[PDB]
Design a protein around this motif. Structure first.
Motif, short mmCIF file in Angstrom:
data_model
loop_
_atom_site.label_atom_id
_atom_site.label_comp_id
_atom_site.label_asym_id
_atom_site.label_seq_id
_atom_site.Cartn_x
_atom_site.Cartn_y
_atom_site.Cartn_z
N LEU A 55 0.85 -1.10 -0.19
CA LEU A 55 0.06 -0.03 -0.03
C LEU A 55 0.86 1.08 -0.02
N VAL A 56 1.88 1.19 0.84
CA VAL A 56 2.95 2.46 1.14
C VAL A 56 3.75 2.58 -0.28
N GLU A 57 4.24 1.41 -0.83
CA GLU A 57 5.13 1.62 -1.99
C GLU A 57 4.18 2.13 -3.14
N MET A 58 3.15 1.61 -3.43
CA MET A 58 2.04 2.25 -4.64
C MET A 58 1.75 3.60 -4.43
N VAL A 59 1.33 3.99 -3.31
CA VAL A 59 0.93 5.29 -3.14
C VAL A 59 2.31 6.36 -3.15
N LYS A 60 3.44 5.84 -2.86
CA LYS A 60 4.46 6.89 -2.96
C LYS A 60 4.57 6.94 -4.58
N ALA A 61 4.87 5.75 -5.20
CA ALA A 61 4.95 5.75 -6.93
C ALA A 61 3.98 6.69 -7.54
N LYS A 62 2.83 6.53 -6.85
CA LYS A 62 1.74 7.44 -7.77
C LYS A 62 1.99 8.92 -7.52
N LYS A 63 2.29 9.36 -6.11
CA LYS A 63 2.41 10.72 -5.83
C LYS A 63 3.56 11.23 -6.47
N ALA A 64 4.66 10.77 -6.62
CA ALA A 64 6.15 10.73 -7.28
C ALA A 64 5.85 11.12 -8.70
N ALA A 65 4.89 10.22 -9.39
CA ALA A 65 4.93 10.38 -10.77
C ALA A 65 3.91 11.26 -11.19
N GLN A 66 2.96 11.75 -10.24
CA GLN A 66 2.20 12.79 -10.36
C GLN A 66 2.95 14.31 -10.18
N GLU A 67 4.01 14.17 -9.29
CA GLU A 67 4.73 15.23 -9.06
C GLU A 67 5.70 15.63 -10.12
N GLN A 68 6.09 14.48 -10.96
CA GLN A 68 6.93 14.80 -12.08
C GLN A 68 6.29 15.32 -13.41
N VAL A 69 4.91 14.74 -13.51
CA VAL A 69 3.75 15.51 -14.49
C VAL A 69 3.73 16.85 -14.00
N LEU A 70 3.48 17.21 -12.50
CA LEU A 70 3.55 18.62 -12.23
C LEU A 70 4.66 19.58 -12.46
N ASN A 71 5.79 18.94 -12.22
CA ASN A 71 7.22 19.82 -12.87
C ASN A 71 7.26 19.79 -14.13
N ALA A 72 6.77 18.88 -15.04
CA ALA A 72 6.81 19.17 -16.41
C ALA A 72 5.83 20.27 -16.95
N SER A 73 4.48 20.36 -16.29
CA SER A 73 3.73 21.40 -16.57
C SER A 73 4.02 22.47 -15.94
N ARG A 74 4.67 22.70 -14.92
CA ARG A 74 5.19 23.91 -14.32
C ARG A 74 6.22 24.71 -14.69
N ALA A 75 7.17 23.97 -15.43
CA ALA A 75 8.34 24.37 -16.15
C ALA A 75 8.80 23.65 -17.32
N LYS A 76 8.92 24.27 -18.54
CA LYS A 76 9.36 23.50 -19.75
C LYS A 76 11.00 23.35 -19.81
N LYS A 77 11.39 22.15 -20.59
CA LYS A 77 12.71 21.71 -20.60
C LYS A 77 13.27 22.31 -21.72
#
Length: 71
Positions: free
Chosen positions: A49-71
């Protein structure tokens, strides 16, 4: 024996928050909360449960990083 059924699983869900990891007697109390399921299943399940919710939130935060600032 059945899989993680709605009742046995919800008894675990509440017992995880009723008795924290900080309690050395956690899973003994979870034995009384969750019958027919062993504490090794309860630990393994909780750990998934902990490993899955960590992986989700981290991935959502990378999507956030991508949409927050352009590469």
């Amino acid at each position: 024996f059945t899989p993680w059924t709605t009742e046995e699983q919800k008894l675990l869900e509440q017992a995880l928050k009723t008795y924290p990891v900080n309690t050395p007697e956690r899973w003994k109390k979870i034995a009384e909360a969750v019958p027919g399921r062993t504490k090794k299943d309860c630990m393994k399940r909780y750990k998934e449960l902990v490993e899955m919710v960590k992986a989700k939130k981290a991935a959502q935060e990378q999507v956030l990083n991508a949409s927050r600032a352009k590469k």
